From Swiss-Prot, chain A:
The organism of origin for this protein: Thermus thermophilus (strain ATCC BAA-163 / DSM 7039 / HB27)
UniProt record similarity statement: Belongs to the V-ATPase D subunit family.
Residues of the full protein shown: 55 to 159 of 223
Primary role: Produces ATP from ADP in the presence of a proton gradient across the membrane.
Protein name (record): V-type ATP synthase subunit D
Domain of life from the UniProt record: Bacteria
UniProtKB/Swiss-Prot annotation, chain B:
Phylogenetic classification of the source organism: Bacteria, Thermotogati, Deinococcota, Deinococci, Thermales
Species whose genome carries this gene: Thermus thermophilus (strain ATCC 27634 / DSM 579 / HB8)
Function (record text): Produces ATP from ADP in the presence of a proton gradient across the membrane.
Record family assignment: Belongs to the V-ATPase V0D/AC39 subunit family.
GO biological process: proton motive force-driven plasma membrane ATP synthesis
Classification via Pfam families: vATP-synt_AC39
HAMAP family, alphabetized: ATP_synth_C_arch
Swiss-Prot/TrEMBL keywords: ATP synthesis, Hydrogen ion transport, Ion transport, Transport
Name of the encoding gene: atpC
Gene3D superfamilies in alphabetical order: ATP synthase (C/AC39) subunit, domain 3, V-type ATP synthase subunit C domain
UniProt cross-references to SUPFAM superfamilies, sorted A to Z: V-type ATP synthase subunit C (SSF103486)
Domain of life the protein comes from: Bacteria
GO CC field: proton-transporting V-type ATPase, V0 domain
The name this protein goes by in its record: V-type ATP synthase subunit C
Curated annotation (Swiss-Prot), chain C:
Organism listed in the record: Thermus thermophilus (strain ATCC 27634 / DSM 579 / HB8)
Organism lineage: Bacteria, Thermotogati, Deinococcota, Deinococci, Thermales
Gene3D superfamilies: 6.10.140.810, ATPase, V1 complex, subunit F
GO molecular function: ATP binding; proton-transporting ATP synthase activity, rotational mechanism; proton-transporting ATPase activity, rotational mechanism
Family: Belongs to the V-ATPase F subunit family.
Zinc-finger in keyword set: no
Biological role stated in the UniProt entry: Produces ATP from ADP in the presence of a proton gradient across the membrane.
HAMAP family per UniProt: ATP_synth_F_arch (MF_00312)
Keyword entries, A-Z: ATP synthesis, Hydrogen ion transport, Ion transport, Transport
InterPro entries: ATPase_V1-cplx_f_g_su, ATPase_V1-cplx_fsu_bac/arc, ATPase_V1_fsu_sf
GO BP: proton motive force-driven plasma membrane ATP synthesis
Protein name (record): V-type ATP synthase subunit F
Domain of life: Bacteria
Amino acid sequence: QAAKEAYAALLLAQAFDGPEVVAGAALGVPPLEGVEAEVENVWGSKVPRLKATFPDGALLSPVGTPAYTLEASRAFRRYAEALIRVANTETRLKKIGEEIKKTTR
Amino acid sequence: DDFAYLNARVRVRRGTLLKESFFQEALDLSFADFLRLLSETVYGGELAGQGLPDVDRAVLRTQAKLVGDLPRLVTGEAREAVRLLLLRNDLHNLQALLRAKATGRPFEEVLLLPGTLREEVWRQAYEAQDPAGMAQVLAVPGHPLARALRAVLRETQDLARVEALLAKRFFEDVAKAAKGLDQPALRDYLALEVDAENLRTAFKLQGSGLAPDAFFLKGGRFVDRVRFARLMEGDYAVLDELSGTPFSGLSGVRDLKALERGLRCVLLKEAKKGVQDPLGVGLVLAYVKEREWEAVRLRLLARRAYFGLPRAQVEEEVVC
Amino acid sequence: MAVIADPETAQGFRLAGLEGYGASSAEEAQSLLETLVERGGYALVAVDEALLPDPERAVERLMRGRDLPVLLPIAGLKEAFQGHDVEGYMRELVRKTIGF
């Protein structure tokens, strides 16, 4: 909710301050393995995991909208961080799938 | 020259400014009822679609014909005085334009409205293929923001740096010209704009380990290098010693959002009591802050209504 | 990356530090979703709960296995939403683990 807080409040004050916000901030996460993939052998077959941490900056874009710009930049963290939880459980889901099915089998 | 006709043209326009009691009504409305309300106003008069892209566009186009047409209607000594105000809205277009040429991205997704540089100046600049040529095309309307650009472009071709040194050099340029065009009303305001900029430069770059003297430029009222250095360490005890200025209200506040909210409300206030000085640039000064702030609240009230956000999240930011 | 979300909320994930290629183009964003994960030249692909694909089999059969995840739940809008706690808990219990 605190990610979106600023996002949704920077849409009709953005679409011409889109340019500004993306400039001061740390440039895009790599599309080829921007995330940190980890391999791990465990029962319930060899399932790979991963954690979503990458650079994106925070409270450091110069110029632009007084409050919103900086608050939107900071918000990128609340994607990253938050995403790690789902990053481990949805991969854990696929592991515990294997077990459950072989068990009842 | 002269503001005699021009002030008069603006006085009729101050009649169709949006009073406080509109935003009061609008919060109580859903998006469907908001849309019926909005259409009564002059921003409503440029409307072209119920959805969000269309609200952003109706607002912008209202600002393009009623506010961005002011520098053409005067010349000379009048025009330089009005121009400095307009220039901030032109810098926003310039920084985005400079960035579309440099990083190779399309013309689109930028701010365009007339002000001091016309639409065609931004198109001819875009299509220019040498940064130096890009710069002469910009220098055609004449303004201090060229002269500011020109010096920075001689030192560097790095995007982030041009952006910062242009802004710093530009407010410094503005200040000297403005002091030489006189009037007490403009001087008091100018001081606040620089003081607000100083505070704000310090906040945006907070904790980057940098020099605090780089965030202080002349034009001040009560702020200095030491307050900046403490502020940079993360200490907000400096704002709690800041009174005798209308930023007395920043005391005991330590959130970036409340702090920055505070500066925009203070600047609004100075300008709104410049109507006890309507002679010369005073009235226009008050007129531009109010059209800008009004436009901003209709965009926030429209966003708040569409996505069903919490009321208090926006009720506080739509009043000073 | 890409986040696959509503047009307006997709907007805020295209900002620098993050890389999004969202927007709705269907009710489960099939139009986009499929084409995009087919290459798997994005570090992460994520599908929200304002769309979420009712046939997950459709995707798996096209991407043909993936060592990177897909369809991570993000809310996809803000309206004070936090029903994505208990919803995800039951999403789990229905297809795997114990019943009710």
